[PDB]
Design a protein around this ligand. Structure first.
Ligand code: HEM
Ligand code: HEM
Ligand code: HEM
Ligand SMILES: [Fe+2]
Ligand SMILES: [Fe+2]
Ligand SMILES: [Fe+2]
Ligand SMILES: [Fe+2]
Ligand SMILES: [Fe+2]
Ligand SMILES: [Fe+2]
Ligand SMILES: [Fe+2]
Ligand SMILES: [Fe+2]
Ligand SMILES: [Fe+2]
Ligand SMILES: [Fe+2]
Ligand SMILES: [Fe+2]
Ligand SMILES: [Fe+2]
Ligand SMILES: [Fe+2]
Ligand SMILES: [Fe+2]
Ligand SMILES: [Fe+2]
Ligand SMILES: [Fe+2]
Ligand SMILES: [Fe+2]
Ligand SMILES: [Fe+2]
Ligand SMILES: [Fe+2]
Ligand SMILES: [Fe+2]
Ligand SMILES: [Fe+2]
Ligand SMILES: [Fe+2]
Ligand SMILES: [Fe+2]
Ligand SMILES: [Fe+2]
Ligand SMILES: [Fe+2]
Ligand SMILES: [Fe+2]
Ligand SMILES: [Fe+2]
Ligand SMILES: [Fe+2]
Ligand SMILES: [Fe+2]
Ligand SMILES: [Fe+2]
Ligand SMILES: [Fe+2]
Ligand SMILES: [Fe+2]
Ligand SMILES: [Fe+2]
Ligand SMILES: [Fe+2]
Ligand SMILES: [Fe+2]
Ligand SMILES: [Fe+2]
Ligand SMILES: [Fe+2]
Ligand SMILES: [Fe+2]
Ligand SMILES: [Fe+2]
Ligand SMILES: [Fe+2]
Ligand SMILES: [Fe+2]
Ligand SMILES: [Fe+2]
Ligand SMILES: [K+]
Ligand SMILES: [K+]
Lengths: 154, 155, 154, 154, 155, 154, 154
């Protein structure tokens, strides 16, 4: 197992761990406000990050590294829907940047299996970016209050 | 026999339920009359819940050899629009949970642990209703009154 | 809506609310005593009164009146089976007298829909009277202890 | 068959015939405009009036009168949703006034079967008035645009 | 590892369960022998209920690293006719609920909230049993003994 | 009903009552240690003794004796698996010796129905002896740790 | 919501969050080693703590407090089965100590619903303690290699 790939994998894992907690708190904030459609979708984003974390832990162990679940970076918590969506988007853009750098390194040392795992995680992060950007655009097109109204009921 | 002051408390809680039954049922039918059928149906289910709480209170009172008091009906808090009605229900529930907390203190003090457990089950349900009410009031502010009513027209 | 019909309807509603609470207490007393068949039949009487009140509240609102659920008249509570049944029978006879007077006024002002609602309620209150007098008569024909024995188990 | 009862029934029938055409045209206007939920409900109001007419026709023939499907009174056609609902409401209020006078006459000559038919029709017309007043009320509470938005899709 | 006095209370409750098990089983089989099969069946199910309580107490005592006492059997209260047997069961239950209340107080004092919740569940069941017994005794007075027994011949 | 048969039946019943409690405690001990296969089997042994006690009680009542559920003899409680199994085995050998004397006495006074009941219970105790002796022999053949390992999981 | 109760709830939440990561890493270490039955049971312990965490966050938000998902305390990671089980046990004993103190405070300020939630979590934690002490006892009774052998396959 290449020491620097393992480092990259733990960096990605650290980003997942941030996103699990940020999205889960955002989910329960929306549910508490009665915006249950947003809350449910955000919950599923949290679950996806949990599964990404699982696969990174498994790969790190296989490569004989030490998965780092101890270091938890800064959660970006908003206080209304629009800030929450933008905080999620900022966290995702950072995450895809780290994924690109880790893929470069995997290719360099010929760890093609790790690359393929990171590429699958990256496809899903870009789908998340697409979702978040689409929501911010909808808020502009239909208005904030209409947008929130359409995310009250599941 | 039951402790006389526990029975007193239980009859106080029962009196609160009886207010809530009538207040929520009328509010339900006002919302249905207005064509706000989603609010009406939810409020109907709140009224049903209080009916079931009253039933369990009546049964416990009788087991404790008290006289259940269904004669004294306190003051209903009837609003005339959706905002007032939600706030009236919230005001009733806040008083209701305060009385439930005092009743639980007294059950614990005389070691009536079954009655305490009944009252805690009712209390958890009242706190869920408070959560529902504060959420609806909060949503009115976020989405606008007219949008909120619109969303509660159709089941 | 005619103001005097609304008053009449609120008077019928007031009787229903007495009956609801009287029958519900009587039901739970019989249950507490282990007379579960009596308790169960009295429960369904209470439910029937609940359903009458519902229809009255709906009609009052449509006629642009204010349903009165605040005023609760005197419950007639008995302390044994024979008294409870007679208390219920007394309440029903008062209720049918009020219903007839309301039907007369509905007819006079041509509120035929309210009349028809009150007539449906009146048929149901006559069936309850029939039930009650029948129970009172069975107590005489089979004896009190036998009558109670036969209403122990559902 | 009493001549004046039959004349009353033919009057009620004439009101039904106006209502059939007015509600059907209003339904198809709303469908044309893409307000398909309003259109579907107005269609069902039209169908109900068709069934009332059918029953009145059968009764008139049994009483050996001549059902009058030739005279069509004035259709009250609105140009927008508010006017259209109010036009229906004005038609219904006229229909219920005529129904009450017909019921009076049925009672006075002891045609109790014709009375009961007219009362069943009256119960349905007061439900329709309830519908119409509720919709005009919702336009006030939720705003016209929102109300129309909520009745686009079935 | 569990609290010594909680364990002693739990063993005391268990001893009460072991008396009820045997007392209710014997009464059940006496009623069956006499052809009062409805009373025999209900009394059997009361005995089974006590067996399940005993089981939960034994498991909890072991988890707390105490020694379940199944050796000491106190006095069965056996009646010789239906009215005595119901009253003996009732007298046993009233003793059992007094002891349950004292054990719950001790659990609360030392913060053994899980043992308290178990005892509260048992107490709920014993008050349901007290309700059954007082109701049967009240029915003997209301319908007469002979009618009462008649109604409990067939299942 | 012969007084000495009844004494014999109460003696067997007294043995069943010891066994019920001894086996139930041993079952829950094994369950608590996580030897859930030993614990489940011992639970079923306790259940069987409960069913023997039931049949004995019914027989004693029919013979117009008084069933003695009051006097509970000494439970033999071991502190590890090998002792617990040997304690059960010692209890069973005492029980079968008492059964044999009870059957002799039933045969002598021609209580053939009681004898046949005792023979059925005796058949079941000898199956329990077989189980216990078999478990003790398996401990010698496969070793204690393997024997316990094989009875962790149901 | 009482500020000190919210502090207690956030402290319990903080313990849940340690347990999530510690149990999930331990689960995946056991799966990596081929001890898949140990890994699967540890995964379900991790899921349980995720659910507790969820209930705490919902209650804190309802009490109008701020759930703290940012502070992650120290994971106790073992390097073999016996150390990992003991690290989970040490974490659980600390968690039940904090739960008892939080329940005391809920009682004192009459927040009986929060107490009931904490009591439910506490019952689950005591079941986890029972599992953990049972596994440690079994290692002693059947020996380590036997115990690990029995937890290779699911
Ligand atoms: C002392 C007062 C009352 C008590 C104790 C009581 C109790 C109950 C109970 C136990 C039920 C069955 C709930 C279930 O398990 O689903 C019920 C049903 C119902 N109650 Fe009440 N109730 C009371 C007053 C009222 C009032 C004042 C109204 C209306 C104005 C009402 C309307 C209804 C209706 C419509 C149902 C459903 C009936 C059906 O369709 O089956 N109740 N009530
Ligand atoms: C320490 C005392 C006892 C304990 C802990 C105990 C425990 C149990 C348990 C847990 C059950 C299962 C009930 C269920 O879940 O449905 C049971 C069943 C039963 N018990 Fe006991 N019991 C005890 C004493 C007795 C005694 C003394 C008798 C009779 C004299 C008895 C007769 C029965 C019978 C007939 C059953 C049903 C068995 C079947 O499935 O056929 N038990 N017992
Ligand atoms: C190390 C961090 C975490 C990891 C690796 C992780 C992993 C997982 C996995 C693999 C699942 C199953 C998903 C599926 O396949 O459907 C899951 C479920 C779940 N997680 Fe997490 N999780 C973590 C943190 C959290 C946190 C911090 C919370 C809440 C505050 C949480 C809440 C949940 C919930 C509610 C479920 C669904 C469980 C159920 O009800 O079945 N997770 N987690
Ligand atoms: Fe909520
Ligand atoms: Fe991810
Ligand atoms: Fe790199
Ligand atoms: Fe792949
Ligand atoms: Fe993501
Ligand atoms: Fe959406
Ligand atoms: Fe809603
Ligand atoms: Fe309506
Ligand atoms: Fe309530
Ligand atoms: Fe008090
Ligand atoms: Fe409970
Ligand atoms: Fe409530
Ligand atoms: Fe009862
Ligand atoms: Fe009625
Ligand atoms: Fe009048
Ligand atoms: Fe009708
Ligand atoms: Fe009635
Ligand atoms: Fe019975
Ligand atoms: Fe079209
Ligand atoms: Fe019509
Ligand atoms: Fe006329
Ligand atoms: Fe008819
Ligand atoms: Fe119409
Ligand atoms: Fe609509
Ligand atoms: Fe469309
Ligand atoms: Fe028999
Ligand atoms: Fe018990
Ligand atoms: Fe104590
Ligand atoms: Fe519990
Ligand atoms: Fe009991
Ligand atoms: Fe265990
Ligand atoms: Fe046996
Ligand atoms: Fe002998
Ligand atoms: Fe045989
Ligand atoms: Fe045996
Ligand atoms: Fe295992
Ligand atoms: Fe693997
Ligand atoms: Fe937990
Ligand atoms: Fe504190
Ligand atoms: Fe709860
Ligand atoms: Fe735990
Ligand atoms: Fe394998
Ligand atoms: K809108
Ligand atoms: K082996």
């Amino acid at each position: 197992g290449d020491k620097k790939v393992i480092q990259h994998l733990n960096k990605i894992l650290g980003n997942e761990l941030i996103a699990i907690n940020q999205y889960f708190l955002h989910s329960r904030m929306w549910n508490f406000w009665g915006l249950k459609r947003l809350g449910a979708h955000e919950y599923h984003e949290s679950i996806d990050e949990m599964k990404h974390a699982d696969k990174l832990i498994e790969r790190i162990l296989f490569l004989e590294g030490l998965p780092n679940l101890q270091d938890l970076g800064k959660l970006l918590i908003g206080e209304n829907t629009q800030e929450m969506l933008q905080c999620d988007l900022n966290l995702e853009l950072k995450a895809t940047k780290d994924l690109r750098e880790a893929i470069v390194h995997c290719e360099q040392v010929h760890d093609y299996v790790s690359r393929d795992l990171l590429k699958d995680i990256l496809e899903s992060e870009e789908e998340h970016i697409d979702y978040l950007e689409t929501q911010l655009g909808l808020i502009q097109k239909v208005g904030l209050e209409n947008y929130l109204q359409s995310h009250m009921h599941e």
